[PDB]
Amino acid sequence: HMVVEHPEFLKAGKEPGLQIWRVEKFDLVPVPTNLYGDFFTGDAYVILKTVQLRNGNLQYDLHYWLGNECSQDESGAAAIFTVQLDDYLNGRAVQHREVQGFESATFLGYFKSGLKYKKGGVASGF
Amino acid sequence: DVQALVIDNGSGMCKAGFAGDDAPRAVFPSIVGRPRHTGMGQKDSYVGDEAQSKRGILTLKYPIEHGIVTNWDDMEKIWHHTFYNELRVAPEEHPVLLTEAPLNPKANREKMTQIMFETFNTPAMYVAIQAVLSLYASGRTTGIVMDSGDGVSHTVPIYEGYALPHAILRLDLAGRDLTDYMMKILTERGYSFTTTAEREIVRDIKEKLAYVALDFEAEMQTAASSSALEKSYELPDGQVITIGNERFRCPEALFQPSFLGMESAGIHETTYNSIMKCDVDIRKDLYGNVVLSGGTTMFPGIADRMNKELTALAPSTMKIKIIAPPERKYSVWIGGSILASLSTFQQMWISKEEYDESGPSIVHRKCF
Numbered sequence: 001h002m003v004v005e006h007p008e009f010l011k012a013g014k015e016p017g018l019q020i021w022r023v024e025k026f027d028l029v030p031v032p033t034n035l036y037g038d039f040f041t042g043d044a045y046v047i048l049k050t051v052q053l054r055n056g057n058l059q060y061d062l063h064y065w066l067g068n069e070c071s072q073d074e075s076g077a078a079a080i081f082t083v084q085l086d087d088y089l090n091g092r093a094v095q096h097r098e099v100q101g102f103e104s105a106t107f108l109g110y111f112k113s114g115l116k117y118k119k120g121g122v123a124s125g126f
Numbered sequence: 127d128v129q130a131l132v133i134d135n136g137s138g139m140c141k142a143g144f145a146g147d148d149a150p151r152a153v154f155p156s157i158v159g160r161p162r163h164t165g166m167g168q169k170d171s172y173v174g175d176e177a178q179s180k181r182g183i184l185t186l187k188y189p190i191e192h193g194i195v196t197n198w199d200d201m202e203k204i205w206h207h208t209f210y211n212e213l214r215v216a217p218e219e220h221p222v223l224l225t226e227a228p229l230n231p232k233a234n235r236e237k238m239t240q241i242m243f244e245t246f247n248t249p250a251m252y253v254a255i256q257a258v259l260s261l262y263a264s265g266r267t268t269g270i271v272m273d274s275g276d277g278v279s280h281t282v283p284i285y286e287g288y289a290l291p292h293a294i295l296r297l298d299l300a301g302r303d304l305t306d307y308m309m310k311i312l313t314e315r316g317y318s319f320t321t322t323a324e325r326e327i328v329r330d331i332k333e334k335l336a337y338v339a340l341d342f343e344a345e346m347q348t349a350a351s352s353s354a355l356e357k358s359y360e361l362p363d364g365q366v367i368t369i370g371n372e373r374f375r376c377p378e379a380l381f382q383p384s385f386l387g388m389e390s391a392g393i394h395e396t397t398y399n400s401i402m403k404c405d406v407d408i409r410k411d412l413y414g415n416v417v418l419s420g421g422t423t424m425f426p427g428i429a430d431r432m433n434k435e436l437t438a439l440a441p442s443t444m445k446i447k448i449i450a451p452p453e454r455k456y457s458v459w460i461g462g463s464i465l466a467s468l469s470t471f472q473q474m475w476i477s478k479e480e481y482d483e484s485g486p487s488i489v490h491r492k493c494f
């Protein structure tokens with residue numbers, strides 16, 4: 001009787017590009033596009049990179065980024081939302097765990113000028 | 127708005143609480159007691175701490191064995207108690223997330239579902255695999271969880287959020303066997319612990335003083351050569367006893383099950399064997415994300431020892447990482463609390479409406 005209704009899922013992975021959400025109290029909240037690449041070390045984020053393939057289908061890489069100080073509800077939620085988004089995208093996404101200071105070359109490469117860290121973030125949902 | 131409940135039904139201890147809390151509100155023995163003789167103490171049944179305390183007039187039953195429900199009448203009594211006495215809720219008012227052991231029989235998942243909806247009239251429910259909840263609690267979607275509780279230890283490989291059932295293995299040894307083994311080896315020193323209160327003493331000795339030796343042979347030699355590893359323990363009556371190599375011999379049984387006369391491989395080999403049952407292309411990610419969960423993983427030294435043993439089994443260029451969160455006695459419950467709190471989970475539960483249309487077998491389509 002249930003379909004995926006989360007507004008952000010309906011927006012996810014529709015066209016080539018980068019989309020970033022932050023975990024805020026057990027919800028997935030879009031990051032303003034002008035703040036892309038500035039990560040709060042107290043928070044966890046989900047990043048979807050969508051690339052156009054030659055047959056016009058879309059390639060997905062889902063990265064969940066975990067700040068050094070993010071709380072367990074945030075990192076746990078980031079991991080679960082990543083699984084849910086992959087399921088929503090028909091299992092077409094490769095999932096990548098990205099830890100502050102140890103991110104993959106691929107993830108770092110998304111940010112043309114280099115990603116930046118800043119202290120702080122939104123309060124834990126616990 | 128609507129407040130979900132989270133219940134992790136362990137073979138030894140039930141952990142129950144409210145989604146969005148960082149810890150279970152109620153942690154109590156998974157025991158039902160009934161009047162021992164059919165002749166005060168006078169209620170039809172008792173559950174949890176009160177049943178244990180009244181054991182002198184009650185016969186005690188443990189309806190969960192190896193994480194699998196073996197007596198549904200007793201399990202229903204435990205859940206009724208959990209809702210009405212431990213959580214102080216009306217279960218008809220709350221979605222309920224329940225946990226299940228890896229490879230829980232199909233008929234059992236259906237029975238769980240039938241009881242929630244038909245006996246408790248829950249408006250919604252969901253069943254999650256314990257190991258997967260622990261992995262989520264550690265902030266990962268891929269890894270292998272070594273979950274060791276009361277009667278059984280499971281190794282559960284998980285890739286991108288889903289367990290790989292063909293690669294799940296088990297060692298039929300966990301905390302109750304280690305308590306029983308500590309009881310046996312303490313008799314060598316002349317200390318007889320045989321009653322329930324005495325077994326509880328032994329459990330406390332295991333929980334407070336035992337540790338996993340990094341090098342067992344070397345630790346035995348150190349213990350034989352001097353008193354450096356000895357520790358004193360005060361009994362409730364006030365007597366002080368001395369414990370030596372029993373401290374690390376007890377949890378050594380996890381790595382050497384022959385100590386208990388079992389032919390099974392130790393937990394390190396079980397973990398390795400599960401990894402080797404998985405697609406070669408995911409094994410790197412499993413070795414690099416070995417997550418310990420459950421009460422019997424709480425021994426000091428266990429993560430160092432797992433690291434050593436898995437490093438010896440794997441190719442030398444493989445990065446081994448053992449993740450042993452301090453909260454790992456509760457990581458299943460915590461994973462549940464997070465999952466049940468997500469804005470997306472209202473879309474995931476089995477609703478009463480769905481149950482009414484499809485019956486218990488809906489659980490195989492909604493929860494996997």
Ligand SMILES: Nc1ncnc2c1ncn2[C@@H]1O[C@H](COP(=O)(O)OP(=O)(O)OP(=O)(O)O)[C@@H](O)[C@H]1O
Nearest residue numbers: 136137138139193275276277301333420421422424
């Ligand atoms: N600090 C500790 N050190 C060693 N063992 C411990 C510690 N704390 C608890 N235990 C043991 O953990 C066991 C209970 O573990 P846990 O609560 O994870 O099991 P369970 O969930 O009831 O069972 P299962 O998951 O096997 O159905 C008991 O045997 C207990 O003595």
Ligand SMILES: [Ca+2]
Nearest residue numbers: 042043121122
């Ligand atoms: Ca935060």
Ligand SMILES: [Mg+2]
Nearest residue numbers: 136137275420
């Ligand atoms: Mg358990």
